[PDB]
Design a protein around this ligand. Sequence first.
Ligand SMILES: [K+]
Ligand SMILES: [K+]
Ligand SMILES: [K+]
Ligand SMILES: [K+]
Ligand SMILES: [K+]
Ligand SMILES: [K+]
Ligand SMILES: [K+]
Ligand SMILES: [K+]
Ligand SMILES: [K+]
Ligand SMILES: [K+]
Ligand SMILES: [K+]
Ligand SMILES: [K+]
Ligand SMILES: [K+]
Ligand SMILES: [Mg+2]
Ligand SMILES: [Mg+2]
Ligand SMILES: [Mg+2]
Ligand SMILES: [Mg+2]
Ligand SMILES: [Mg+2]
Ligand SMILES: [Mg+2]
Ligand SMILES: [Mg+2]
Ligand SMILES: [Mg+2]
Ligand SMILES: [Mg+2]
Ligand SMILES: [Mg+2]
Ligand SMILES: [Mg+2]
Ligand SMILES: [Mg+2]
Ligand SMILES: [Mg+2]
Ligand SMILES: [Mg+2]
Ligand SMILES: [Mg+2]
Ligand SMILES: [Mg+2]
Ligand SMILES: [Mg+2]
Ligand SMILES: [Mg+2]
Ligand SMILES: [Mg+2]
Ligand SMILES: [Mg+2]
Ligand SMILES: [Mg+2]
Ligand SMILES: [Mg+2]
Ligand SMILES: [Mg+2]
Ligand SMILES: [Mg+2]
Ligand SMILES: [Mg+2]
Ligand SMILES: [Mg+2]
Ligand SMILES: [Mg+2]
Ligand SMILES: [Mg+2]
Ligand SMILES: [Mg+2]
Ligand SMILES: [Mg+2]
Ligand SMILES: [Mg+2]
Ligand SMILES: [Mg+2]
Ligand SMILES: [Mg+2]
Ligand SMILES: [Mg+2]
Ligand SMILES: [Mg+2]
Ligand SMILES: [Mg+2]
Ligand SMILES: [Mg+2]
Ligand SMILES: [Mg+2]
Ligand SMILES: [Mg+2]
Ligand SMILES: [Mg+2]
Ligand SMILES: [Mg+2]
Ligand SMILES: [Mg+2]
Ligand SMILES: [Mg+2]
Ligand SMILES: [Mg+2]
Ligand SMILES: [Mg+2]
Ligand SMILES: [Mg+2]
Ligand SMILES: [Mg+2]
Ligand SMILES: [Mg+2]
Ligand SMILES: [Mg+2]
Ligand SMILES: [Mg+2]
Ligand SMILES: [Mg+2]
Ligand SMILES: [Mg+2]
Ligand SMILES: [Mg+2]
Ligand SMILES: [Mg+2]
Lengths: 123, 154, 102, 319
Amino acid sequence: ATLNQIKRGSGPPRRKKISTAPQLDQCPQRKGVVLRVMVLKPKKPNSAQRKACRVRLTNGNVVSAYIPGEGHDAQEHSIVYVRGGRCQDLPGVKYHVIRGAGDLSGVVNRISSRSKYGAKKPS
Amino acid sequence: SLVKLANTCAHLQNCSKVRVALTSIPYTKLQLQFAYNLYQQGFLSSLQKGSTMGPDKDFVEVTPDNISTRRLWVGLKYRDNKPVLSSCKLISKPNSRIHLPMEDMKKLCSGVTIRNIKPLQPGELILVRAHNNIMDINEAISKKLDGEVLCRVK
Amino acid sequence: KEIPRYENRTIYGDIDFRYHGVKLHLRSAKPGFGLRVNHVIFEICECAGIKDLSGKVYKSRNDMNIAKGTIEAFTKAQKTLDEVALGRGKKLVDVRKVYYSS
Amino acid sequence: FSRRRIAYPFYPFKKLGRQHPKKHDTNLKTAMRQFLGPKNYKGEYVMNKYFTVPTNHVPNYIKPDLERGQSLEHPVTKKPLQLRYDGTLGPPPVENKRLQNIFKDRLLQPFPSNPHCKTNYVLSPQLKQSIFEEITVEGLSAQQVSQKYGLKIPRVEAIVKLVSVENSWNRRNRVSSDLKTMDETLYRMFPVFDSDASFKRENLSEIPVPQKTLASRFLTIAESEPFGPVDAAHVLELEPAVETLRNLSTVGEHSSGHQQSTNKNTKVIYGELVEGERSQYKFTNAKVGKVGYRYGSGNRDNKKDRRIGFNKLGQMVYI
RNA sequence: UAGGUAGUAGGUUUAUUAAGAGUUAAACCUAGCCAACGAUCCAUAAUCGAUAAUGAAAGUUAGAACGAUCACGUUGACUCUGAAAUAUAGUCAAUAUCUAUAAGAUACAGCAGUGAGGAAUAUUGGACAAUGAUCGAAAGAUUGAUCCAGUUACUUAUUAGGAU
RNA sequence: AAAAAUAAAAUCCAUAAAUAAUUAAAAUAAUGAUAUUAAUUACCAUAUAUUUUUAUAUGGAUAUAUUUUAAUAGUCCUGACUAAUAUUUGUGCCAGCAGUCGCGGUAACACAAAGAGGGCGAGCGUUAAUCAUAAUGGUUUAAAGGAUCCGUAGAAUGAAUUAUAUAUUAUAAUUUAGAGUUAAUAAAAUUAAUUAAAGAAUUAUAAUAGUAAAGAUGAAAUAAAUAAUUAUAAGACUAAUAUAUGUGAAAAUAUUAAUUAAAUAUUAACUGACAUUGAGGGAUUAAAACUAGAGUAGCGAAACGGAUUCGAUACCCGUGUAGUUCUAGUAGUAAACUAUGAAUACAAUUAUUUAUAUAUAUAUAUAUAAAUAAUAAAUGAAAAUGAAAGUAUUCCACCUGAAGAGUACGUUAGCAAUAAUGAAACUCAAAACAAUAGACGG
RNA sequence: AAUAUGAAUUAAUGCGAAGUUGAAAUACAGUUACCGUAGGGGAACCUGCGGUGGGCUUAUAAAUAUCUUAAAUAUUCUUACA
Ligand SMILES: [K+]
Ligand SMILES: [K+]
Ligand SMILES: [K+]
Ligand SMILES: [K+]
Ligand SMILES: [K+]
Ligand SMILES: [K+]
Ligand SMILES: [K+]
Ligand SMILES: [K+]
Ligand SMILES: [K+]
Ligand SMILES: [K+]
Ligand SMILES: [K+]
Ligand SMILES: [K+]
Ligand SMILES: [K+]
Ligand SMILES: [Mg+2]
Ligand SMILES: [Mg+2]
Ligand SMILES: [Mg+2]
Ligand SMILES: [Mg+2]
Ligand SMILES: [Mg+2]
Ligand SMILES: [Mg+2]
Ligand SMILES: [Mg+2]
Ligand SMILES: [Mg+2]
Ligand SMILES: [Mg+2]
Ligand SMILES: [Mg+2]
Ligand SMILES: [Mg+2]
Ligand SMILES: [Mg+2]
Ligand SMILES: [Mg+2]
Ligand SMILES: [Mg+2]
Ligand SMILES: [Mg+2]
Ligand SMILES: [Mg+2]
Ligand SMILES: [Mg+2]
Ligand SMILES: [Mg+2]
Ligand SMILES: [Mg+2]
Ligand SMILES: [Mg+2]
Ligand SMILES: [Mg+2]
Ligand SMILES: [Mg+2]
Ligand SMILES: [Mg+2]
Ligand SMILES: [Mg+2]
Ligand SMILES: [Mg+2]
Ligand SMILES: [Mg+2]
Ligand SMILES: [Mg+2]
Ligand SMILES: [Mg+2]
Ligand SMILES: [Mg+2]
Ligand SMILES: [Mg+2]
Ligand SMILES: [Mg+2]
Ligand SMILES: [Mg+2]
Ligand SMILES: [Mg+2]
Ligand SMILES: [Mg+2]
Ligand SMILES: [Mg+2]
Ligand SMILES: [Mg+2]
Ligand SMILES: [Mg+2]
Ligand SMILES: [Mg+2]
Ligand SMILES: [Mg+2]
Ligand SMILES: [Mg+2]
Ligand SMILES: [Mg+2]
Ligand SMILES: [Mg+2]
Ligand SMILES: [Mg+2]
Ligand SMILES: [Mg+2]
Ligand SMILES: [Mg+2]
Ligand SMILES: [Mg+2]
Ligand SMILES: [Mg+2]
Ligand SMILES: [Mg+2]
Ligand SMILES: [Mg+2]
Ligand SMILES: [Mg+2]
Ligand SMILES: [Mg+2]
Ligand SMILES: [Mg+2]
Ligand SMILES: [Mg+2]
Ligand SMILES: [Mg+2]
């Protein structure tokens, strides 16, 4: 662009990461109530029965959150805390529920990476 | 005219690439001062007044009758299969003129990028215009003069 | 090939060289500055004996073309102070070196 | 490409063979026992050539590359001893030529991989007394003693300060036998300084390298124009380098030229002291616009660069 | 959001003010004024630094903390006093609560604290010893300003055992 | 060379805390909330010597010695990016992991663990955010040149000399190289608009003799002839030349003549920077389409038929309506393309035309421009570009991953079809260009 | 009148798995493709009109050739002759 076109607005586009958790409203996490627990099928080439859950956040936004870990006790009306982070193979599941918070317990018998699964230290 | 000076800077680069020993530039005060600075700095072998057809052998007074046919003829230098005058670029452009105080000229000669102007490099000539006179930046700093940074020759 | 080195540590001035799609901007550096450049350029400088150098690569960052571009730049884009002086018939003085001379 | 690499010795050693199941040994541990040699009943390693200190003013620094890992020698004859198939120590089959003509520089190099690190020379107890008696009694200047013995002025000033501490200690019988034993042992471990030896003399022309000058400025002048150190100094807007060296030699407390009086121009008032007062007020004239604690200054207490200092009593205090 | 403006743009005169001016009110004239270098309208937001964050730098971000400035003290308007207030005053009205049922009192964005909301932010602490502020001639009185402590890894720093 | 591991225990020596004594400073005339103050000292006090500090000796104080005495870190990670080689077990596209690429289907370095190992550390991880991490950019062919030109603003850019000033700007004077005006001389007959003409053929009709098939197709079938020689009528079109060469702003433009308008080169004189570019704006703008009034031969969406075909809402054939034509308008879109905005200065060659000029021993020869072709250099991802897509300068338009989308909504304009303007959400780690070697080709 | 919210009601589009009906595109893709526009059809698509090459520059013969000392001379020649 010419010098006058730059004076009129022309310039390099700016590089800044965009929000991937718009429903949280720029909060680390938001509380919610599980509307319905569901099992979804990964997009190819993956195969599994991925446990997810529909959740209504305290701000009125309804989202789909992935339940990490082996085994969960989440039901309808269970109070859950939702954080950012998408499930890559499940399209439309852009959030994660936090294990060990609210009514969702920590992964049973988890030994490694316990802090990521709400598991307390064994004595 | 800075446009004319830009034309001359590009012309000299073109002549160096083909390695012509002699070329002509427009006959004006600014061009003559520009060429004279290059001659004194060892970038040009010769500087002669002349006409459109070639350098004058004997003095020919310039008048309105022949002003349109006057040209300045400069000799280019080549050593060790390399051109002495490899690049010639303007700093102050027609659409963006740069005037610097003597303090900022000293920073430019010390390695500091001033107003996006890359600092003076080893063996490079930066010319400055002050009160319609062209001089080396080091000379302008010695005379405490503020002026327009015109071009850089290497 | 032999590459000119200023004080056997760095390059003579700055270099803006275009090798195919690779835009190389290399700047000379003070003693003790170290090599702060693309990793490909770093290795070449180590073998060549360049100790102080700064620079950035623009556009294409293809390793193969950076290495070849760097070698070409070190030979075709540099001019020694001695070569500049002889071509112009002038004396070029390193002010920093004279300041510490007898 | 990178992977974890156990630090096995670079030199050849006798690796472990078939091992009884309860030994639970390692190749690193056995390589160390071969370096150390047998341990006697007193807990010593007499066969290792580094167990005992040198007593001839020649440092005994490790030379693994030159001896190829053979660190064992006879404790009295100092003759090389190597491990054999029997498990005993005996003369090597072939003499090591790399250990008989060692360069002078290497002898003073403690670390094999760093040839830029060398030990310093220890000053003899006589040169120290001479320097002490010349600066204090004869009244010579530190610049003269520095230029005479080839010692940097700071070192000369330190010797005077330290010898004064040794006189008070010797005047009060505070230097015990153990301290004398230790001092002599350490003295016989380092190469003694020789003022006459030109190579041993310290360079006396060193000046701190400024930062503004560290850049590389170049000037294109006429082919026959003279340009010298003074001209360069004007270009760099610094005092000539020779002047800097001269000003750095007049800093020693016992050096010539030491002067400090241009600052005795600040009006000070000492408040009246009355009986019963526990402190005296001292007032120093200042100028409005310079004196005072500024308003809205950056608080750094909660930042990694929080300023920490030490008071007159040596207690850590936040600045 | 492409047309906007009608005291609107300018001129003259009086009133009002310590004081200029369509600043307000009154009268009479001229037809102007703004606008695609974005008017008018709508939305959003307290602003800034020799403050903080980041970067080689130009910059970008924040506006908690330190400091400067503005605005507000449940909402709106008006009046009094005064050099200065549409005052955390007074008056009237609105909303809510309260008890004494009065043309009543209160409004914690002062401190502490409680409920609510939220992923999330503390003691219903001590002292006027210090630095200030108010009253008093003084003696002194008052001060949730302030100074200290409590709670909380929220941040920083130090320490959290060396030889063999 | 498979270690865990100097790791542990053990040994030596310490300090913190405790205990005891002592005790500042914040504050003094006095007042201390903090406060069970900090710090110091290790029986307390004193004298002497004694950088510090040390040391001796003394007064009181206990039984020759003099209070006691320690040390349990977590958290993430080890396929690549990315530091982590010592292996092993379970699971088997399940369970699960995942920032990106991906991992898992029985030898899983990636899942869940053991061993060993790598980080950071009273924190570690994770989520939410901020800054940095490439414009020291691009638009023939990858996102991106506006259909074209004219021209307004430009707080855009732009000749020469001299003199001042308060200085890259202003002013004044002067100048002619850019840009123009008027002639003279030579050259050319194109491009617009309008008017007036010509030509071959086609279809229809009639006549004439002359017949029985003709026409069509891959083959077929649907709808006194065909052919031949005359005569009449109508509409549309424009063979060779011909290269769209050339001309025109582009769109466009090739049968003839005329009228009006514009267009070339050089020379002479004249003006004296009056220029370039150009937001907004304006004008023109293929084909199709639309509104009126004419025309309608041939061609020909559609429609109705005939074939082909497994089917044939097609390709082929028939009948053939709109349309194609003219007049007056609307509309402003095309692969409106050189997929390449305009202007200026400049750079190495050849060949071939064209134009002007010069010369002669008159038909060539010598010059200077333009065009085209092939190139050097340079540029470029390359293909290639080649006087630009090179070296530079000035101005305008435009682009910022794909898809969604040139869509939705709104607005403006139009008789209408539509044209212009022009998003976001969701989803994904794609998507695209040049070139290389293959494979394949009815 | 504006802003916000819900909203009967209603339009467009994305991704996900395989199927169904055809075979439109990439080779001459079996009717050259595509651009603008109009009409028609289950669907891709088909047809008309002009435009573009991002398809044919992929371009490669009607052939015909001549006289001066052939050598005792050219062909050899080594810094010589001149
Ligand atoms: K606006
Ligand atoms: K007080
Ligand atoms: K660890
Ligand atoms: K390109
Ligand atoms: K043409
Ligand atoms: K003029
Ligand atoms: K203009
Ligand atoms: K325009
Ligand atoms: K017709
Ligand atoms: K343009
Ligand atoms: K087709
Ligand atoms: K079409
Ligand atoms: K079509
Ligand atoms: Mg690694
Ligand atoms: Mg007003
Ligand atoms: Mg007035
Ligand atoms: Mg009025
Ligand atoms: Mg607000
Ligand atoms: Mg800011
Ligand atoms: Mg802000
Ligand atoms: Mg606050
Ligand atoms: Mg108020
Ligand atoms: Mg109020
Ligand atoms: Mg009030
Ligand atoms: Mg309140
Ligand atoms: Mg409160
Ligand atoms: Mg709550
Ligand atoms: Mg908090
Ligand atoms: Mg509490
Ligand atoms: Mg209180
Ligand atoms: Mg203690
Ligand atoms: Mg008090
Ligand atoms: Mg007290
Ligand atoms: Mg994991
Ligand atoms: Mg397995
Ligand atoms: Mg991993
Ligand atoms: Mg694992
Ligand atoms: Mg383990
Ligand atoms: Mg810490
Ligand atoms: Mg940048
Ligand atoms: Mg361009
Ligand atoms: Mg175009
Ligand atoms: Mg286009
Ligand atoms: Mg002219
Ligand atoms: Mg017939
Ligand atoms: Mg024709
Ligand atoms: Mg042409
Ligand atoms: Mg124009
Ligand atoms: Mg046409
Ligand atoms: Mg009609
Ligand atoms: Mg049909
Ligand atoms: Mg049919
Ligand atoms: Mg048909
Ligand atoms: Mg029209
Ligand atoms: Mg369209
Ligand atoms: Mg278009
Ligand atoms: Mg066309
Ligand atoms: Mg023009
Ligand atoms: Mg549209
Ligand atoms: Mg391709
Ligand atoms: Mg077909
Ligand atoms: Mg097909
Ligand atoms: Mg086809
Ligand atoms: Mg059809
Ligand atoms: Mg067609
Ligand atoms: Mg094709
Ligand atoms: Mg082709």
